[model samples]
Target chain A: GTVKVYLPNKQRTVVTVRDGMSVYDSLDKALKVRGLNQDCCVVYRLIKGRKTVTAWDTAIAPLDGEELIVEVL
Target chain B: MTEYKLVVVGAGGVGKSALTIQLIQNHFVDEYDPTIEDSYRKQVVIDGETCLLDILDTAGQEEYSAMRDQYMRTGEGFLCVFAINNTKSFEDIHHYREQIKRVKDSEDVPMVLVGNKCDLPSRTVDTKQAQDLARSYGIPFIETSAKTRQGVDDAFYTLVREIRKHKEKMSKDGKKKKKKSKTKC
Candidate 1:
């Protein structure tokens, strides 16, 4: 019903999406999911509309379960 | 008399909250207390004699920026903790450091790079790398074992020392000692 996860058909999902209580309250809540197999994931930012590995805040957004996408460019 | 606020942040399983609880109350949760909720916070008063540490334990990941931002506004400094065994958790600093950048006083702001769970051999990040994050950041690094009380003293004292320095700076204002700030007029 809700578009909770939005993916960038443009790039590949470098990381996987996780589920649980909302990440808005705590980083541990989200990081736990990421840590389950965090290495497999790569993160990206909307660098000129291309998924580029630049900054953590940039890459971690969509990944934080906020209408996310695993865009791997 | 001095007062300081310290916060902890990092990827999950790195034991950020556990370390905070341990330092403040000296206890650990058997399981991830789901009842405890996601975001958690606690306040501690040192001795009310000389130096004091007011701490905020925060979530390290991204989606929680709004909440983290609120917490950031309160803390004078932060401790970025990660598992030595979890290299990605440590390496994630490259991304998480942005969150670490908050400080009421930039040059005066003291950020401690803490490597928790150092006792774990499966650790992915090494000592040199841990030090590098601090050196490059130009703050300090204290490899700690919250489980064994290894660098716990150092990790805590380091921040306390710096905060005491700020308290002096604040002393000049005087109003800091009181409940509110007022004008001389």
Candidate 2:
């Protein structure tokens, strides 16, 4: 599945992941593509125009085009 | 150089980004972006001390409330912003302050109460009321206009000063405890 990731730097990227991949793994791959350290970031989903919290181990369902926002704290 | 982690928080449409962007980018953001979270860095001199300010402009919408604990725990100081023209926004200031205190577990957290959007002609929140609230909380209150860049610098600089005082007090207390322990030995 391909997922769109919005980074804290106002940049967005698309990453392809295998089915049943964990949210943390998918986010780690997205960060790797952007050269951002996975150790310092977390991911959130924009559901219904709101940033819904996603657990680290939650499996990533195939989202047609929804973007996952990554926040670097 | 010292680094200060300042968090800007308030209810939605309260101009949290306006004030922060005014300080960092030197311009007002005309469009409203429901920011999930944005971090900005600026090198500034406050009270003759050069320091780097890492500001976390957080999401003001209630949906993003889950993310508050992360930043609130790490923020050294906070700018509790509200629009002077919006009474509800002004009233929500108490929730942000209390949450910050609860997350940090300290009553002496460094904070500044900011009434933003002073450039607007009509106002709903009285300056006296805001001042009284700040006085009760023992924090500085300032009215700001992010559009005209009024009181923008003062709001942030004031938080830096508050953080400086907090650090000084903590160090003094630590030294006093050390001296007492030595005397007992």
Candidate 3:
């Protein structure tokens, strides 16, 4: 499934994710492809407008067309 | 009014959420309610100056450990909270400090070590122990009781002041470099 992840510069990096992979795994590779390794920033999701998805949980898995905000620390 | 982001982190049942509620709402819930990682915004006055405070009451379960880096990254300040009645929570204090340092890439980050549930009769960790740990990290420490609301505001106020002090220092550093940029815009 293709997902939209916002970079720290407010640009979106649409990643093609694979099955049987956690969001963390997808993010680690997706970010690196965009020249952003995990060491530089953290991933967040505005769930119901709340900064609730700080980590890759089962609740906020990368479903079809999921949008995420990657905030630089 | 300036705004600051404060994150509270520790083990579950350590009263991180409770401590936040006491400062934000001035009330405490008796029963233990698992946090849903909610963010609360409150306008507070410290030292006769008004400011916006965005407090992130984080989930303390071990499962959330992997996500701690992200949360720490966005925060301007932190509260390493632990319950006085629980020794295990006291032991985990270093983890919060270490994570924040690694995420923020600074050892001198503004932080406070909070000993919550001070109103409880069955106290396990003494003030001296917690204070010593905070001293080691060079951060302020406060023992608070959400039930009675003791030292709740003091803990928050101190951290905000620390952040301001750092901002002033950074501004001076920039001035030395001949940059006209604001301190902490």
Cα lDDT computed for each candidate against the true fold = 0.56, 0.77, 0.74
Q: Indicate whether candidate 1 or candidate 2 has the larger TM-score.
A: 2
Instruction: Summarize candidate 3's per-residue lDDT along B105-178 as a digit string, tens digits.
Output: 98889998889888899999999998998999898789987778788888888889988889998877766677
RMSD of 3: 11.7
lDDT of model 3 at residue B78? 86
Which pairs, if any, clash in model 3?
none
Which stretch of 10 consecutive residues in model 2 chain B shows the poorest summed lDDT? B176-185
Model 3 chain B, TM? 0.87
Q: Mark the regions of model 2 whose C-alpha exceeds 4 Å error after superposition.
A: A1-73, B63-66, B178-185
Candidate 1 stretches with Cα past 4 Å from truth are A1-73, B34-49, B62-64, B102-108, B165-185
Cα lDDT of model 2 by residue, B96-134, tens digit: 788888989988898999988888998989999999999
Number of the predicted model whose TM-score against the real structure is largest: 2
- Cα lDDT tens digits, model 3, A1-73, are 5565676753454455566767677676446434466775778766776654466544334455546788876
Instruction: Please say which candidate is ahead in DockQ: 2 or 3.
Output: 2
Sort every candidate by TM-score, greatest first.
2, 3, 1
Instruction: Give the chain A TM-score for each candidate.
Output: 0.30, 0.74, 0.67
